[PDB]
Design a protein around this ligand. Structure first.
Ligand SMILES: [Mg+2]
Ligand SMILES: [Mg+2]
Ligand SMILES: [Mg+2]
Ligand SMILES: [Mg+2]
Ligand SMILES: [Mg+2]
Lengths: 96, 283, 182, 56, 8, 127, 211, 21
RNA sequence: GUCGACGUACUUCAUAGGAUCA
RNA sequence: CGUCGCUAGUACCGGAACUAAAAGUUCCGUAGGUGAACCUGCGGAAGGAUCAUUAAAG
RNA sequence: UGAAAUUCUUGGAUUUAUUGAAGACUAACUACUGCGAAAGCAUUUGCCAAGGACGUUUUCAUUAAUCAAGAACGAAAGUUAGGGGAUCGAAGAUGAUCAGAUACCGUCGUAGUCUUAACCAUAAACUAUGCCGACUAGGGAUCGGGUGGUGUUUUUUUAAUGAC
């Protein structure tokens, strides 16, 4: 337990955007490759789509998206990708 | 290497050179020759000092087949190592690595140019332009202001140069004073070097150093020898005499408690005269 | 070939791997080097002695001593076996602290930078320079030929001083190419 | 500013004249460039000895 | 394990 | 019938010293360094220098009467590295091969409890 | 033009009778033009294993100073004690507290000396904690007990008797027994012995020591 | 030339023998 | 003086992403 | 195969003789800077890529 | 050093050993664990006062939270006046200026680094994250205290403590 504690501690301190970004991609690849995540039946898709339509949480009327857009912050590529990554995720939930 | 490409700044440089038609121009750092053609256009004749044979050859090809052939002259070598001909105006965009020597060499030319337009790094240019009491006032400022007067012409930004450097640049005008003031270069330089070790401390504290005492005592021994007066040559013989001499001059001049960075030309000159009066010669 | 002895003290954290690997350690020492082997549990140290009647190579005893010492520092067994096989392999050691005084998170990141993600950066250096590197906390040991270890030390030192791994990796390819040329 | 400048120039002229009144050479004088050294090699000591012998 | 604690 | 010496090995970055003296340490029997056994300064720290150096000292020791040596390897130590380098190891191997009996091997690197500042400076050294 | 070893002469060192093996090798010196002056003040360091003929003392070294010379025999006396560096580096380990004590004390023979003792905490048989750090109060109590024991042992003995105690490590047993209740310990050792001052020389005390 | 970033299967005896041969 | 700092006013560079089709 | 050359040397009275001549990382605070397209000292930060081994009072 | 060269050296350098002197710093143990309002804080022992938490069927009874004004301290660097001056070391000088993974290297080294009496009050002074109060999941590790056991070791007379 001590060894994992020390290793977990050191990883917690590292809060570099790129480092986390690499780690997240690799984790997603393994999970997809191993198919750890169960398939969503038609009901799971319907409920998810319902909530998304119910709230419209994945459009540029959100606070963070509006703040970035209105102040010429999204001209930069990196933030534009993040705004994009939000938008495509909403579109995925909108798919029928 | 970095190459300028904004034509406007170069045009301003050649314009502010104010080169009379009977002037011979020493153009350091020819590079491709963007400045050189325009200097040739409004000059009697031009002498160019290039380090790279290929760039000099390219300049020759560029100029070849024009009216301005007989005017141009290209010297190949290292600028310091070469002994230069008479020149009236100096226009340079040379690598900054040679900025400080360049200046002084122009000062120590047997017949110094009346005007020169030099491109220097912004920090270096401000140090050249610093006035007494400024933060960046330094030995360079005082010395160059003794032998010349420097003014600011332009601030040249990073974008103009390709590939971009990591520091901005500027263009200044240097004016060597004719007649040269009749103060020995060595003595001035020695006094300044002793006084500028820490420019924000008292001049007295500048002199309190032991090695300064050793140098000044040896200098006093040598001077007494020159005047045929005998001297014992023991290491600490007149440490106690030179110490009192320095204390008295510093007290009477009232420069003891004044920081070097806030001292002007006249203050240093008075200090030099006092130290001479009491018999100490610095260099 | 006279009667001589050597002792090498195994630290606590390595002896269980010695237990893990000892079945493969005493055979080469006893058959090839003709060396009579033992370790004292009471002192927890390996005792090697030259047997005058059977041992023949004068350098056998010292060769075995360095072989265990190579294992003691943390090198894998087969990596250490090269020392017995060859005669021109030496171990270079130094701390990060000699290179630079790094403490706290600076120290931890420096160790991570040398190892690299999943040990790739260390795996980069070992192959290009034809050596092995053990990153024992702030303690670095490099095993290989004399000329080989010096290139390895330079790259490791560059990482400690702050050189990003990518530029170090590019240089490794360059020197790696020159190694194949010669 | 102009009047203080001119007064400063006059003071400078007087001081520089008085400096020409009293002047010497600087070849034998040790430069202040040595302030950082604080220790001399045997070559430098021999050069100093030769110079002093030439002086007498 | 031949020679763990004795000469081998 | 077995007279003992002490083989002092000082392995620095740029050279290796093999110094054999009596048990007290006061009287030196033979001192050889990598510089004397090699034509170029670069190879003085090379192990090849060390083995030549070690063999010569061993040859001298046999002539004098010394047949066994206690090895006291050391490095520069102090504010610098505390572990002997390859030069020391190569010399030690040569001494064993030379036929001199090696009594005891011990490390006596100068290890400071707490030392002065190192030469490198804040940004480091040894690029 | 002169090979120095032509003019050298060999001398044989002898050890205190407190040690089992008196023979500890030989040294050499330039022949008297005297040799005795060069011999006096010379020190030789040797492992206790060689003198006692047991590997149990392999990590202990004794420094002996040449104090007298008679007929190519160099009569020495105890000058210092230390451990091998490897042993010390072995004892120091992570996840434990290092307790060290030093005491300055003079023997009954006016031999002023300094003793350094070291010890480490240990985990018990049923311990399940990774580490065994001891509270500062326990460290201070143990240090006081160790200092008192060392002072009592040194003051109530002569230097020869002091070495006679060092060789069998009785002092370590006494220390661990005394400090047992305060906190369990391991690797209790008299790390070092320095000889600060020496009384006026008495050749009689050296001859009686050497029999 | 591309440099391997994984642990070498060959052992240093093997690499140095390949260098020898 | 094509001077420095600040204040003020303006200009300018960083916008594409997913799906299908050829 | 000849003449004078050019390079080096020897002598003689610019001149006139002789010999030889295998080449084609990102920063912050502060303090400085006279080979400043930038460097340097001290303190701090990650906004910088953790491999292996590891109860041996077992 | 990539190789050299300034540098020391047959008056004996480098190295060996017996000492002596000076000024810093507290390795390994050392861990984001501990203490402090923060900056910071690490050898032994003594003295001076200070503090959190724990235990309390003790005591006063709203005395409290936040805080313009105002006050104490405030890393490193820096200034004034003494002291000290070992190491390292801005500046300065000087050797070399050949070769791009080792491309900024070497030697001497002023101020400083240390300390005493005052100034200066800035840091990525970072958890890039105000302060007080309440509530909203499971799990085992650690630091300090406390409660409990008919638990182990120890006191090698018991025991009682200490450590588990
Ligand atoms: Mg603690
Ligand atoms: Mg002072
Ligand atoms: Mg205040
Ligand atoms: Mg902090
Ligand atoms: Mg709260």
């Amino acid at each position: 337990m001590f060894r994992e504690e020390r290793k977990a501690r050191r990883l917690k301190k590292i809060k570099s955007k790129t480092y986390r970004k690499i780690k997240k991609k690799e984790l997603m690849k393994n999970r997809e490759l191993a198919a750890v995540s169960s398939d969503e039946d038609n009901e799971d898709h319907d409920i998810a789509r319902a909530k998304e339509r119910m709230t419209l949480k994945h459009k540029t009327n959100s606070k963070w998206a509006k703040d970035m857009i209105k102040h010429g912050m999204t001209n930069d590529a990196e933030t534009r990708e993040e705004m994009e990554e939000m938008l495509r995720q909403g579109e995925r939930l909108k798919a029928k | 290497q970095h190459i300028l490409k904004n034509p406007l700044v170069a045009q301003g440089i050649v314009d502010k050179a104010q080169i009379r038609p009977s002037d011979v121009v020493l153009e350091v750092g020819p590079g491709t020759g963007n400045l050189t053609v325009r200097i040739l256009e409004q000059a009697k004749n031009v002498v160019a000092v290039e380090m790279d044979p290929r760039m000099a050859a390219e300049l020759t090809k560029r100029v070849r087949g024009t009216p301005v052939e007989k005017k141009l002259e290209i010297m190949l070598g290292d600028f310091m190592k070469t002994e230069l001909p008479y020149f009236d105006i100096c226009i340079s965009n040379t690598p900054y690595q040679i900025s400080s020597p360049l200046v002084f060499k122009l000062i120590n030319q047997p017949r110094p140019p009346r005007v020169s337009i030099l491109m220097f790094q912004r920090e270096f240019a401000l140090r050249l332009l610093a006035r007494p009491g400024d933060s960046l006032y330094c030995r360079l400022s005082a010395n160059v202001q003794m032998w010349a007067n420097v003014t600011h012409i332009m601030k040249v930004g990073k974008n103009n140069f390709r590939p971009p450097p990591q520091v901005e640049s500027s263009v200044v005008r240097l004016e060597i004073k004719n007649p040269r003031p009749q103060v020995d270069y060595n003595e001035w330089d020695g006094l300044l070097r002793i006084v500028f070790v820490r420019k924000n401390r008292t001049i007295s504290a500048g002199f309190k150093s032991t090695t300064v005492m050793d140098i000044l005592e040896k200098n006093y021994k040598t001077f007494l020898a020159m005047n045929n007066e005998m001297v014992d040559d023991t290491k600490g013989s007149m440490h106690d005499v030179v110490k009192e001499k320095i204390d008295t001059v510093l007290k009477e001049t009232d420069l003891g408690d004044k920081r070097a960075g806030k001292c002007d030309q006249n203050d240093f000159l008075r200090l030099l005269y006092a130290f001479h009066q009491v018999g100490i010669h610095f260099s | 070939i006279k009667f001589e002895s050597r002792k090498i003290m195994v630290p606590p954290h390595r002896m269980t791997p010695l237990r893990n690997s000892w079945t493969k350690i005493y055979p080469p020492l006893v058959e090839h080097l003709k060396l009579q082997v033992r370790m004292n549990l009471k002192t927890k140290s390996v005792e090697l002695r030259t047997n005058p009647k059977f041992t023949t190579d004068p350098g056998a005893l010292q060769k075995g001593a360095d072989f265990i010492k190579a294992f003691t520092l943390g090198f894998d067994l087969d990596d250490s076996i090269a020392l017995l096989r060859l005669d021109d392999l030496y171990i270079e050691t130094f701390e990060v602290k000699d290179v630079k005084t790094l403490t706290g998170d600076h120290l931890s990141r420096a160790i991570g930078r040398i190892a690299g993600k999943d040990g790739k950066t260390k795996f980069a250096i070992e192959n290009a320079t034809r050596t092995r590197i053990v990153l024992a906390d702030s303690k670095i040991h490099i095993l290989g030929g004399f000329t080989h270890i010096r290139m390895a030390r330079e790259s490791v030192v560059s990482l400690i001083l702050g050189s990003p791994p990518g530029k170090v990796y590019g240089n490794l390819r360059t020197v790696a190419s020159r190694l194949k040329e010669r | 500013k102009f009047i203080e400048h001119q007064l400063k120039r006059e003071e400078r002229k007087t001081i520089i004249g008085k400096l020409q009144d009293y002047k010497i050479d600087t070849s034998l004088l040790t430069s202040s460039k040595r302030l950082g050294e604080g220790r001399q090699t045997k070559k430098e000591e021999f050069k100093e000895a030769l110079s002093l012998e030439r002086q007498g | 394990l031949p020679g763990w604690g004795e000469w081998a | 019938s077995q007279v003992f010496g002490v083989a002092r090995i000082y392995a620095s970055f740029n050279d290796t010293f093999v110094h054999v003296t009596d048990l007290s340490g006061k009287e030196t029997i033979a001192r050889v360094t990598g510089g004397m056994k090699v034509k170029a300064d670069r190879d003085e720290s090379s192990p090849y220098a060390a083995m030549l150096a070690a063999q010569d000292v061993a040859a001298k020791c046999k002539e004098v009467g010394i047949t066994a040596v206690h090895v006291k390897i050391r490095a520069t130590g102090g504010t610098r590295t505390k572990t002997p380098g390859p030069g020391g190891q190569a010399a030690l191997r040569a001494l064993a091969r030379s036929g001199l009996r090696i009594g005891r091997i011990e490390d006596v690197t100068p290890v400071p409890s707490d030392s002065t500042r190192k030469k490198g400076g804040r940004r480091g050294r040894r690029l | 033009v002169v090979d120095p070893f032509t003019r050298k002469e060999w001398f044989d060192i002898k050890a205190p009778s407190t040690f089992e093996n008196r023979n500890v090798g030989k040294t050499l010196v330039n022949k008297s033009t005297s040799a005795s002056d060069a011999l006096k003040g010379r020190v030789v360091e040797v492992c206790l294993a060689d003198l006692q003929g047991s590997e149990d003392h392999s990590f202990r070294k004794i420094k002996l100073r040449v104090d007298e010379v008679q007929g190519k025999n160099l009569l020495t006396n105890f000058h210092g004690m230390d451990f091998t560096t490897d042993k010390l580096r072995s004892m120091v380990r992570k996840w434990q507290t290092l307790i060290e004590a030093n005491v300055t004390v003079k023997t009954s023979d006016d031999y002023v000396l300094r003793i350094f003792a070291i010890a480490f905490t240990r985990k018990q048989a049923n311990q399940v904690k990774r580490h065994s750090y001891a509270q500062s109060s326990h460290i201070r109590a143990i240090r006081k007990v160790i200092s008192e024991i060392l002072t009592k042992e040194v003051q109530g003995s002569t230097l020869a008797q002091l070495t006679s105690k060092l060789i069998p490590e009785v002092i370590n047993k006494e220390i661990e027994n005394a400090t047992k209740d305060i906190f369990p310990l391991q690797n209790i050792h008299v790390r070092k012995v320095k000889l600060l001052k020496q009384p006026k020389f008495d050749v009689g005390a050296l001859m009686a020591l050497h029999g | 030339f591309e440099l391997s970033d994984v642990k070498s299967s060959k052992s240093l005896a093997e690499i140095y023998e390949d260098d020898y041969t």
